A paper describes a structure:
In our comparative analysis of the structures of models 4 and 6, we noticed an unexpected outward rotation in the linker that connects apoferritin to the [name], resulting in the formation of a two-helix bundle rather than the desired four-helix bundle. To facilitate two-helix bundle formation, we incorporated a glycine–serine (GS) repeat linker that extends 12 Å beyond its predecessor. Additional enhancements included strategic mutations at the apoferritin–[name] interface designed to bolster the stability of the [name] component (see Sections S1 and S2). The sharpened density map showcased the strong density of the apoferritin core, along with distinct density for the [name] and its associated [name] molecules. Dimeric DARPins were observed encircling the C3 channel of apoferritin, while the [name] molecules firmly anchored to their respective DARPins on the outer surface of the scaffold [Fig. 2(b)]. Model 6c notably succeeded in determining the cryo-EM structure of our target protein, [name], with such clarity that the side-chain density for nearly all amino-acid residues was discernible: a significant achievement in the realm of structural biology. Our scaffold, with its high-resolution [name] structure, outperformed other reported scaffolds by requiring the fewest particles, thus reducing the demands of image collection and data procession, and setting a new precedent in efficiency.
In this study, we present a novel [name]–apoferritin scaffold, with a larger size of around 1 MDa and higher octahedral symmetry, meticulously engineered for the binding and imaging of small target proteins via cryo-EM. Our most efficacious constructs, namely models 4 and 6c, feature a designed ankyrin-repeat protein ([name]) rigidly linked to an octahedral human apoferritin via a helical linker. The 24-subunit apoferritin framework allows the attachment of up to 24 target proteins without steric hindrance, an extraordinary feature. The modular design of our scaffold allows the adaptation of new DARPins through minor amino-acid-sequence modifications, enabling the binding and visualization of a diverse array of proteins.
Numbering used by the authors:
A (entry chain A), B (entry chain M): 54 to 374
C (entry chain L), F (entry chain F): 227 to 282
D (entry chain B): 283 to 374
E (entry chain L): 339 to 374
The structure:
Amino acid sequence: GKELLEAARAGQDDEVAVLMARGAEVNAADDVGVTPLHLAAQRGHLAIVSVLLAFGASVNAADLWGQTPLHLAATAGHLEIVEVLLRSGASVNARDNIGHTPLHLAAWAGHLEIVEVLLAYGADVFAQDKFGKTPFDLAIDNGNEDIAEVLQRLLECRRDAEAAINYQINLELYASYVYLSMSYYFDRDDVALKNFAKYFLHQSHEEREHAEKLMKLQNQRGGEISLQSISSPDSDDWESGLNAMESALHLEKAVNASLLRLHKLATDCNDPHLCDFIETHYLNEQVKAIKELGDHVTNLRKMGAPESGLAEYLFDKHTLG
Amino acid sequence: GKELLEAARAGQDDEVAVLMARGAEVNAADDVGVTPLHLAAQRGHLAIVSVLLAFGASVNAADLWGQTPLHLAATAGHLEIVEVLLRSGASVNARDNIGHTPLHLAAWAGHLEIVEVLLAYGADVFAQDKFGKTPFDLAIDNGNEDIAEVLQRLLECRRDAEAAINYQINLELYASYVYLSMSYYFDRDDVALKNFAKYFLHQSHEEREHAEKLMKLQNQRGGEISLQSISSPDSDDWESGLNAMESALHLEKAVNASLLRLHKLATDCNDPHLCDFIETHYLNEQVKAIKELGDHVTNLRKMGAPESGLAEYLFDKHTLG
Amino acid sequence: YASYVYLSMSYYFDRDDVALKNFAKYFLHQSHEEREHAEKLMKLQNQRGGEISLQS
Amino acid sequence: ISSPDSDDWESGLNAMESALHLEKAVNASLLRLHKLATDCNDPHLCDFIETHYLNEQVKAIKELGDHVTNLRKMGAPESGLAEYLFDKHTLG
Amino acid sequence: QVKAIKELGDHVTNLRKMGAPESGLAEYLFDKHTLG
Amino acid sequence: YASYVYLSMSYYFDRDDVALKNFAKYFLHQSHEEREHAEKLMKLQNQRGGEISLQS
């Protein structure tokens, strides 16, 4: 009923064994709320926590102070207990009264391997306590040096991915604006080409769908969209249909280069979902766009444009309409 | 690895406790195939089998001789071990090399309460061994008196239910034959009533569906259908429509009485499915048949039959057609 | 009598140590055809003015 | 929920026989619960048990015993082309 | 009656040639292919 | 510019600490209507013979 806890505290693995074989209280709440699992985690005793878990102990046991065996085990420094608790269902994001999470304590105490296993199981790096500190702060105010480095790397990966997605949103909005300009150039009455105009209006709308997809993505990730100013296109007079097609080709190539840079960034920081998203929705459309626009340019050049009217007229009639 | 079995045999519950707390072989196969559970069941040691089941022992462990902890526990006489094994998934119908089932041994040894708990969990009373004996035989050739009585009661319940279902099949076949006779009486040309004929032919076919339902039932239960001779109806001349309706009424009442006797029999022998079957398919149709045939008889009697032609003519026209 | 024999045959193949379903359907069909056969002869004997006398 | 006793059910015959024993154990538990509800005068529980549970177990046991005798007569498990043709003709 | 006798003799010779009654998989396949 | 402002407004109400979906649909609809409005004026200025000069 109560005589098991002192044997757990003294490390009497055989005594708690023989006394738990006989019907005994496994989920004992004590004079301050310390279950035998808590005391078996404070001291480093793997056999006791194993034979206690097998007999039906609770890994999440709300101590009178707000602690859990994972808290005390991460604070102590015993890695095997941390592993066997994480595999049994311990919650990596449980709070104290101060608000500390097991990673706060892992960073304060200075346990690198425990920090790694806690980061693998879903502990978040920018979580705060009541007083406003993140594990990186408890790491830098205590001289624990490498905890700080491996947490700074993750903070920086998240910040840089957020920034690159914002820049891609701005780049697609700019491309949409450039295509709108191109389209209303071919609508003048000294440039009377209607299917060039329809072509570039269609591209203008597709490029806005592209940017809204990235906005939705960044809201799904929990990041912050920060919209910016959209530059005006470099020209108002796109001299001909050939020159406009070549400018669209260079623009599509620049967009594709930015996508490749963002993909390499998401690969460095171990982000499978971002890489899958980029290559599923964005890398096969750019290849097809570049192929098609290069086809248009060689067709127009062979037919004899720009020095030939009746080349752009018949291209506009037969290929674009 | 092996040092746990002698402690199980000596009844050292605390030793096997402390030694199983430390990583030890729970499903140990030994020099003749005797697992610690077998030896913990032979001797009466409930704590050891509990702490062995909790640590992942197999209740069905094919000994080199064909035994299982349930076999040895039923032979010994310890009821608590039998219960905790039956609740953990022990198979009540496992065989030896001789072919004995745990009930064979429960009946040989003379353990009444174990026989009861084994009968509650699905042990069958007429199972045989290689030499052809049923638990009742091992009970009567050993002077074990009450095992024999409580097994004879069950053998007799099954035999009597089988016999009553056979008799009900024969009774419905006879009723079908009687209705066929009645129907082809009203088809003569000195008895020119067509809707009386259609009525009784319909009843003739319904009563054969009734008997095929009981044949299917008896095949679902695992019993043996034994068909018999069908008597001929008592009359070939059913004097009038009134007299034929009254004879049908008495026949339906006799059939209903037999159904009630069979239901009381199935209630005495604790057979919920048979009772549910009888009252679902058979007891509400008889009530409606009796109500309808009594209605027909009072209508015919009030209109003035049998001493009135133009009473049965108009009944045949208006009520039966 | 033939109808009764076919009914017996049909419910033999329905046991679970004799698990043949289409043998069972076959013999049930024959069981019903043989009762139609006998009702035809009953109708005939009523058309002729004779007396049906059913037996065991 | 305990894990099943085997991961390797040696053949189709052995798996059908194991399913048969499992259905019989389930039916025994239902009968015990029905007797309990009868002792304590609980008409609605008894009606529920025999309406939804006692006629399905009987049909399951009949069908699984049919499958076992068919497979045994065709010549399984020592015969391929017995379980192949059973799988083709009876189960599909 | 003539058609019934012809058909039932056909069934008997088919079953005998396939190898029944000493062969399961003869009555199984007869039941599957001829009667259903 | 008004179209851009409405797009910002719409994707604000899509965050998961601001879980209002019909506010989001509302402001997206307004965002698209305001671009139709500007394309109408571009077409007008091409009908008049003037020069469109787009800006930041």
